[model samples]
Target: IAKIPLDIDTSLVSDGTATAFDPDSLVAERFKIDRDVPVALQQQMSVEAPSNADVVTFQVGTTLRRTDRQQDAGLLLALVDTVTMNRNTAEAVLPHEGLTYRFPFDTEKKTYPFFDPIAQKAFDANYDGEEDVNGLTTYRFVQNVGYDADGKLADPIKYSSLYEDDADASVTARAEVWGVPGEPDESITMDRFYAASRTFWVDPVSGTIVKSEEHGYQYYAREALKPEVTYVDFKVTTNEESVESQVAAASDERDRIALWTRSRHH
Candidate 1:
């Protein structure tokens, strides 16, 4: 049902720092990875009606590229998530995949099943509170990934191992020799594991992400070595310029979207 037409094509970038451990130096150093960190989302919808006439079917292509890195390292995550949902409520129906590509148009102060592309499933993402992004008020939501009830580590993050560009994105590390008290010269194999506190600030009107942040880290651990060593740790958020521009874009569309709500309800 053509209750509300959705069309979006835009990209945003944020700057952040990365702390990566050097195998040669055996020391962790900081590097600027987010200098060109960009995430782009664009909608692709069919002109003809979907299989389900009552719902809208569209695919949003998303790419979170870390341009500072070379080759596969630059392509952090890429997805073309398909979504079919009720036109009025904007709630997802069958064939919904990927991250919460878009939130409901009429978002509420409750929780939603937020999809984690890394884990390839949805989890309860609760409404944290309100946040001010460049003078625009946006609803904040939080999704904690890779943990159990007692805040213990659940599944260690695994690399999806492939890029949209058909590049080899698998992560591997070299064995290092460490002097352990018991072993006195143990060769340690560090396997990467990831976890994050993913947060998003949504412009409630368009359900657009105006600002977002990720407190994410990757650590190295194996069965032989009990201690999890930090591989790369990062805490990043959308930059000020991007936040201001996104707020402006959402504010411009607020009035038009308000009219769409009336047409749907009234």
Candidate 2:
């Protein structure tokens, strides 16, 4: 209802024609979260993974203070994927896959627990409410991340190298297409429309995310495929006043290195 006739015909304007209570389980068409306009954020991304070799990269030095502990924010991450051919680093603030907006939160949502430093675990999140970031109004969440359960998109981070795994990976990945196949091993997966989806905006009373967006893709299918391919379709975005001046200059260089390590431990 486009403002149903704006207070009774100034010239009439209220068209009505909208739908979506579950547009295939909506996952943030909009979002917001402003812990009083930025609390902290950081990341540095680089890409170049496609050529049948399909490398893939990651690097995000992190920090997101503001916690008495037991949730609501408290991180100190650092991860890597410098084109994993062998164990290319991963493990930090743990839950990473385009960070933010997950953790004991709700306005009634899903995808509420991410932190899969390559299957160390903590993945779940979703929310479909209050969204209007940029024109302001906020509160949105959707992290259909590494999707599956038939939502289709896999890589729950257990890449020994294209053998990628998920389903909380204690060990669970069935991506295949082998060198040649007849009627088996043709799982070769990647779902939720290309392995990733991230959208966040929070505040809704201090959940404090502010804004985020992530759209990712990583593919490798076989048996000579049918239309399921993506080498590394990546993108990441977060800039609410440049992460509020990069988390207030990395929290003033971590309080000037804790007062120079307490004056060199006195």
Candidate 3:
């Protein structure tokens, strides 16, 4: 796999924006929960009174090499509903529940749930730009979304706005975020390539992601937010390679080898 370096000082980007709110404000305004509403109430309302049918899907391709030989390739799918909100109580659902699979490995299916949380954290931590994603430009933001005592999303974050950029480039906007939980004072920060979007060719009636790509980056403090040790460093290429190799090695031992041994060489 090709690895690229992405070491840039986050604080140097003075053009970025920041805001601080009561956290509860996200629930009341974006997700539409009442100020005094109980967390359970918000969950029930989300299931019954969904805000919009605007769904966003993210898909990625994964390739695995065993002993320096390409052994497997697979796809990962995820979905997000844009109309739900509650900043203080986390109750976000796994949007990849109905993903279709074209690969034989169960790793693709099982790993998606784990990846979903990271994606959700990214969506919840940054601000959206007004631009097109695959010819559909939009803007969005995350409010003081709620979480449970265990620091999980109580409700899906809210997403909105579609627009064009100053250069008239069609853009669709979404935030990439890194969040800190478990600390008495939790926080979130934005990461590179603010508000991703892309251009495409498509028929108007069929709303689809189409042929295009968008990109963004977010990094969370491993100790406070993610239990798995995730390291972000200045040496982008080396760091990425190290992380990928480490994961591949671990997966080989935990999944591939274990499965083969259990099958008794069948």
Candidate 4:
């Protein structure tokens, strides 16, 4: 487990808006997964509200490589070849069927399966704390790794976010993860620091994340000296299949066209 400061500066909000805001409530905006194919099944995961009063659902999708055993074997072989080399480009080669799937924001994305025993253990160990971040009072939390007999960060891994209530009683915090130490090749040693900010509003009365604004530095590794600020708006949603099917179909159509042209002419 790693410990670091999650800080934010609200002074950048120059526009004369509201005085107070809550980070937890800001994350509650409705969201949907728009996809372009029907071959895969989409899964919806429940999100825990700040106050733990009700469940918030987020969407994810996956498709079967093959409907039959023989088909699956062939698909798996193809995948092995496609990923044989380090195709690290922005747009990598997709599966033959050609469908695209969009995942929810990083915060709600599931890192492990629901049935995994380690999942529950990690959930139990997450902690919430409070601190002052860049002159603004904020809430903070640490997600600790849980073990049965040994006290070590487990294999599945776990972490948590500590949110502070803004003047509007809005709960907000910066969520980040640090790579494990001793991995020399993976270490990030930079003298200049880039800052990113995300604002979430929670219904103080109910403790639900209602709306959120995610702002952060983009392409930091490439142009560290000239970082660009980017922001995303998150909204909550209950309809899972409708959003998934649309996005899947559109993505699949694009893939089919690209693959067909490449095979015939290239």
State each model's C-alpha RMSD to the native. 6.4, 20.9, 22.5, 24.9
Best-fitting candidate, scored by TM-score: 1
Poorest lDDT segment (10 consecutive residues) of candidate 3: 37-46
Q: Output the number of the lDDT-best candidate.
A: 1
Question: Which 10 consecutive residues of model 2 have the lowest summed lDDT?
Answer: 1-10
Candidate 4 Cα lDDT to native:
0.22
lDDT of prediction 1: 0.57
- In candidate 4, position 23 carries an lDDT of 21
**TM-scores for the candidates:** 0.64, 0.25, 0.18, 0.18
Off by over 4 Å in 3: 1-69, 72-117, 121-202, 216-266
- What do the candidate models score in CA lDDT, each in turn? 0.57, 0.37, 0.22, 0.22
Candidate 1 per-residue C-alpha lDDT over 118-156 given as tens digits, one digit per residue, 9 for 90 to 100: 555676677989888777778998888776534566755
For 1-266, candidate 3 gives per-residue lDDT tens digits of: 11111111110000111111122333241211112211100000112233223322222222111122122311111122322222111222234322111111211111111112222343222232344333333232222223433446343222212211111111112221122233444333322111221122111111111122222122222223332111111111112333243333333334544565568856
Name the regions of candidate 2 deviating beyond 4 angstroms.
1-40, 50-59, 63-78, 81-115, 136-139, 142-199, 202-239, 243-266
Query: Which residue pairs come into collision in candidate 1?
Result: none
Candidate 4 lDDT over 218-260, as tens digits, reads: 1112133432211111212213344244334334434554575
| 181 Cα displacement, candidate 4 (Å) | 34
